[PDB]
Design a protein around this ligand. Structure first.
Ligand SMILES: *[C@H]1O[C@H](COP(=O)(O)OP(=O)(O)OC[C@H]2O[C@@H](n3cnc4c(N)ncnc43)[C@H](O)[C@@H]2O)[C@@H](O)[C@H]1O
Ligand SMILES: Nc1ncnc2c1ncn2[C@@H]1O[C@H](COP(=O)(O)OP(=O)(O)OP(=O)(O)O)[C@@H](O)[C@H]1O
Ligand SMILES: C/C1=C/C(=O)O[C@@H]2C[C@@H](CC[C@H](C)/C=C/C=C/CC1)O[C@@](O)([C@@H]1CSC(=O)N1)C2
Ligand SMILES: [Ca+2]
Lengths: 414, 358
């Protein structure tokens, strides 16, 4: 028997979950125009690729993105999902590959029924104190898989989705399904070892952290930046405004090579020391007013490589393995000030850079939308404070033409 | 009553009188650091002094030094009083607003000019060839830009920048000649290598082909006499040097090359004008002077554009001064006279009058 209001979590009540979601599909079908339906039908036929496109579409030139015919499907299916917002939280269930959370080995083989203790602690040590960014279309279940359900990995994600989360219940052949577009980071609050049909699984109790991620929508981003940092060069003491502009108009090279070389300890210098102090407090003036995703296409020497380093060839899988082995899960420090952008799109000036740093910036971190100053060299730029530390949560790779590039999912930990 | 045209670049200032067909003075955009030193006379006193370049990548970054450049321009190069001449200045594409305002403030408050104007360099270049629509590749000593222009209007959202130009090419040629077995490293040696670059380099139509050929022929080898009389030989360095423009990775840069920035710029423009841009690719600046650059650009753009596209690269013999020439024509136009910002307008509205542009 069912209550007349749904619960936040159907748990193992498979039967009410399915019937409820079946009625939801039927209601939601009344709100979709045929372009949305067509997009839904196309999704059933071509799921993998439509989902794969939705994960990495935002990293190309603005004009390449715009010319891509897969945009129609992306935009129309996104819109279908966005229409249908839940009016209170709901918990969902899906399986995930462990390498998704940077655990690049099997928890157990599909033939093993049990998971070792050390495996368990290794997973736990890998996946906690970490925000993992998620993107793209995903099918999720409203009930915990049980006896007779498809169970493709030893890792079950049990995720709480908040109010106003877009969700698209639908029917495919004889299955009731639920579609979301991931646009948030997940926090694994707890893992526990359970058993289902005679095998041990890891169940991850997970929740969501929201952040402004403008991706390729640089106009919306720039609107957001301008309307948050317009006042900002008004609130700078005149002493700060000069050093900022000095930095901005080519001073950054002197200031940053000073920081990187430990000048203030080695061959100290009072003038540009007051400059570092002024630029810093300028960054403390309007702290980043929401959780925010920014992007930086990094030079290879930020990661101990050169253009000609054979280990910068990420088309070779072992070079990707090696890079992960070196950097994934590590914290990383920039003694210099660093530039990032609100936009994810590729650009002429960095067109060939292979390493993209995709950074989570907590609300109130020091920084500023410098591109609220008319005509600044940096495209949609956010400047972060000297000595910033970034935890590298996860390394992904994608294909830009024939070239393999990396996306470093990272978090500003101050 | 004769207007002045001052085209201030990263490496060179080109200056003269509106109505003339060439600048009367062209001198280095350097300051020695009126006891302080500028222009040609600052090079030989370096010194208890080294040379400073106040314009970096097309942008004025030191205003004190820039006042000295401009003082030197009026008094020593042109030998005029600034109070007696309307002065047309040039600026880089996307020059910050505050920068424009500061140029205006200095002209009126420091130099007391009766009138002035700031023009976009790429636009003047385009005007010099009698055009108002086209995409300009402007490559000098310090910066290179693509600037698409439609009926006299620069389209700023489609402007592509590269901080790679003549000086990087000179410096690269120093390195690869040094790898050949010579030694080119000092500031004086950099001038010599610049001269070698200007006299003997060229852009290969097919780079990999031309590298294969280099190991075979010596019809590509050329010689050059140093000031002390040593005659040196230069081979594949002739075309590897400017190849950097199309392959910025040669100097460790991960930016798009100039064919790709040209294409990117066109793709950021309205679909309806793109054929106008493809058919009016105009080159200006000293770093577009390489024999073979136009043919190579033709071929590279052809590889990127639709097979049905009509592509034309316009590279006038005068293109090393087409910005200046464009300013000279402009400042002489009857319809331009209403556009000068007068001293009275500055008094009335302050530096921000440059954006209204009178
Ligand atoms: C358009 O292009 C330029 C400059 O772009 P960048 O943001 O790459 O310039 P940076 O100053 O950030 O890069 C300087 C070079 O030094 C390397 N780097 C930077 N920080 C470090 C650290 N901390 N450690 C080792 N290397 C570092 C970078 O890889 C880069 O090569 C500008 O005009 C834009 O508008
Ligand atoms: N024949 C030539 N071949 C190749 N390069 C040349 C030639 N003549 C001049 N150059 C180079 O062109 C550059 C100067 O050109 P130009 O005066 O247009 O630049 P600028 O205006 O000083 O700099 P920018 O426009 O980058 O601010 C120098 O680097 C010079 O070596
Ligand atoms: C004929 C000529 C052309 C020129 O463009 O000079 C400009 C200006 C010059 C200033 C420094 C020297 C010492 C003083 C020189 C007086 C020079 C007139 C030189 O520095 C450049 O040489 C740099 C270095 S090497 C290069 O590629 N750009 C560009
Ligand atoms: Ca110039």
């Amino acid at each position: 028997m069912a209550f007349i209001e749904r619960p936040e979590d159907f748990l193992k009540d498979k039967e009410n979950a399915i019937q409820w979601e079946k009625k939801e599909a039927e209601r939601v079908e009344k709100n979709l125009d045929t372009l949305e339906k067509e997009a839904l039908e196309l999704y059933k036929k071509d799921s993998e690729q439509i989902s794969n496109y939705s994960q990495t579409r935002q990293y190309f030139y603005d004009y390449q993105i715009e010319s891509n015919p897969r945009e129609k499907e992306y935009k129309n299916l996104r819109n279908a999902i966005s229409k249908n917002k839940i009016d209170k939280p709901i918990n969902v269930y899906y399986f995930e590959s462990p390498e998704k959370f940077a655990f690049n080995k099997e928890i157990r083989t599909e033939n093993q029924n049990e998971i070792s203790l050390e495996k368990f602690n290794e997973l736990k040590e890998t996946i906690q104190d970490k925000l993992f960014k998620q993107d793209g279309f995903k099918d999720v279940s409203l009930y915990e898989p049980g006896n007779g359900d498809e169970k493709p990995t030893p890792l079950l994600i049990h995720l709480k989705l908040p109010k106003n989360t877009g969700m698209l219940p639908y029917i495919n052949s004889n299955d009731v399904k639920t579609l979301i577009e991931q646009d948030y980071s997940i926090k694994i609050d707890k893992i526990v070892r359970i058993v289902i049909e005679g095998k041990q699984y890891i169940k991850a109790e997970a929740s969501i952290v929201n952040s402004l991620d403008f991706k390729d929508d640089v106009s919306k981003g720039d609107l957001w930046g301008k309307e948050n940092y317009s006042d900002w060069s008004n609130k700078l003491t005149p002493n700060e405004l000069a050093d900022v502009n000095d930095y901005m108009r080519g001073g950054y090279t002197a200031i940053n090579n000073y920081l990187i070389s430990n000048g203030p300890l080695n061959n100290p210098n009072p003038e540009l020391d007051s400059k570092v102090n002024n630029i810093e407090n300028a960054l403390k003036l309007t702290p980043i007013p929401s959780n925010l995703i920014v992007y930086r296409r990094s030079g290879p020497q930020e990661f101990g490589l050169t253009l000609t380093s054979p280990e910068y060839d990420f088309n070779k899988i072992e070079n990707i393995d090696a890079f992960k082995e070196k950097w994934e899960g590590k914290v990383i420090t920039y003694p210099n000030f660093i530039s990032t952008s609100i936009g994810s799109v590729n650009m002429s000036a960095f067109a060939k850079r292979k390493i993209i740093l995709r950074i989570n910036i907590p609300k109130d971190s020091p920084g500023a939308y410098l591109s609220a100053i008319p005509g600044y060299a940096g495209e949609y730029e956010v400047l972060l404070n000297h000595g910033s530390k970034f935890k590298i949560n996860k390394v992904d790779s994608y294909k830009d033409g024939t070239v393999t590039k990396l996306i470093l999912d990272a978090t500003l930990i101050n | 009553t004769t207007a002045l045209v001052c085209d201030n670049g990263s490496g060179l200032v080109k200056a003269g009188f509106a109505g003339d067909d060439a600048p009367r003075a062209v001198f280095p955009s350097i300051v020695g650091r009126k006891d302080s030193y500028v222009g040609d006379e600052a090079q030989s006193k370096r010194g208890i002094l080294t040379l400073k370049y106040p314009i970096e990548h097309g942008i004025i970054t030191n205003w004190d030094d820039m006042e000295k450049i401009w003082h030197h321009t009026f008094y020593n190069e042109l030998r005029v009083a600034p109070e007696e001449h309307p002065t047309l200045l040039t600026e880089a594409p996307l020059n910050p607003k505050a920068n424009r305002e500061k140029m205006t403030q200095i002209m009126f408050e420091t130099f007391n000019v009766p009138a002035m104007y700031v023009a976009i360099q790429a636009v003047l270049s385009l005007y010099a060839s009698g055009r108002t629509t086209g995409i300009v590749l402007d490559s000098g000593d310090g910066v290179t830009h693509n600037v698409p222009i439609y009926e006299g209007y620069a389209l700023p959202h489609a402007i592509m920048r590269l901080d790679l130009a003549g000086r990087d090419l000179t410096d690269y040629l120093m390195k690869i000649l040094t790898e050949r077995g010579y030694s080119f490293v000092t500031t004086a040696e950099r001038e010599i290598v610049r001269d070698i670059k200007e006299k003997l380099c060229y852009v290969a139509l097919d780079f990999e082909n031309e590298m294969a050929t280099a190991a075979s022929s010596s019809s590509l080898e050329k010689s050059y006499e140093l000031p002390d009389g040593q005659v040196i030989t230069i081979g594949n360095e002739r075309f590897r040097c400017p190849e950097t423009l199309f392959q910025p990775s040669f100097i460790g840069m991960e930016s798009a090359g100039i064919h790709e920035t040209t294409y990117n710029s066109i793709m950021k423009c309205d679909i309806d004008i793109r054929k106008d841009l493809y058919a009016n690719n105009v080159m200006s600046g000293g770093t577009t002077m390489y024999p073979g650059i136009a043919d190579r650009m033709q071929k590279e753009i052809t590889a990127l554009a639709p097979s049905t596209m009509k592509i034309k690269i316009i590279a006038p013999p005068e293109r090393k001064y087409s910005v200046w020439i464009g300013g000279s024509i402009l400042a002489s136009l009857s319809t331009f006279q209403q556009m000068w910002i007068t001293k009275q307008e500055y008094d009335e509205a302050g530096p921000s009058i440059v954006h209204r542009k009178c």
